[PDB]
């Protein structure tokens, strides 16, 4: 009623930036670690040449 504003907390800048940048760091860490594992040298190159 009265079209009262949504009650944003004054700390919105700090909480927003903490969440945004912590999550960006964590996401980048996961993506980079998973990329390294995904493109890990499969190690069976000592076997490949028979299979190819």
């Amino acid at each position: 009623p009265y079209n009262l504003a949504y009650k944003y907390n004054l700390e919105y800048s700090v909480v927003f930036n903490l969440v945004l940048w912590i999550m960006t760091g964590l996401a980048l860490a996961v993506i980079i670690t998973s990329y390294n594992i995904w493109n890990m040298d499969p190690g069976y190159d000592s076997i490949i040449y028979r299979m190819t």
């Binding site: 998973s34 069976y44 076997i47």
Partner: protein, 150 residues
Amino acid sequence: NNPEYSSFFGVMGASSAMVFSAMGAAYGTAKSGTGIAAMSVMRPELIMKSIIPVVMAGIIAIYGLVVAVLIANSLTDGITLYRSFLQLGAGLSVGLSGLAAGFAIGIVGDAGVRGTAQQPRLFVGMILILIFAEVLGLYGLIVALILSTK
């Protein structure tokens, strides 16, 4: 009263637990199946014994399903934001640990099946290494369960 957008993080916990576990299982199955396909052309009779890595990869998808269903059945409209965060944390802790376990299972299974083609004695060690790779997803499940039931 609790905020209206609270259920979002719980729903993301459920969907993440399922999605990332499915990605881990998909990668594990893909690499293990490629290994089995390369192994077969030379050693046909090992094909069935060499499906075990695919099964251990599927365990990870089952773990993701367990956590996703648990969170989904725990969701509510008035879910407190704290519970929403717990569910998101559990969902990621199982989903991404299962993704890592799927990577481990896929790589170990591919290399181990190819090797067992050439030297049967490897099979036991391959199973042990796959167990060590899958217990990572198991630990992710444990953390997800502790968070969620808390």
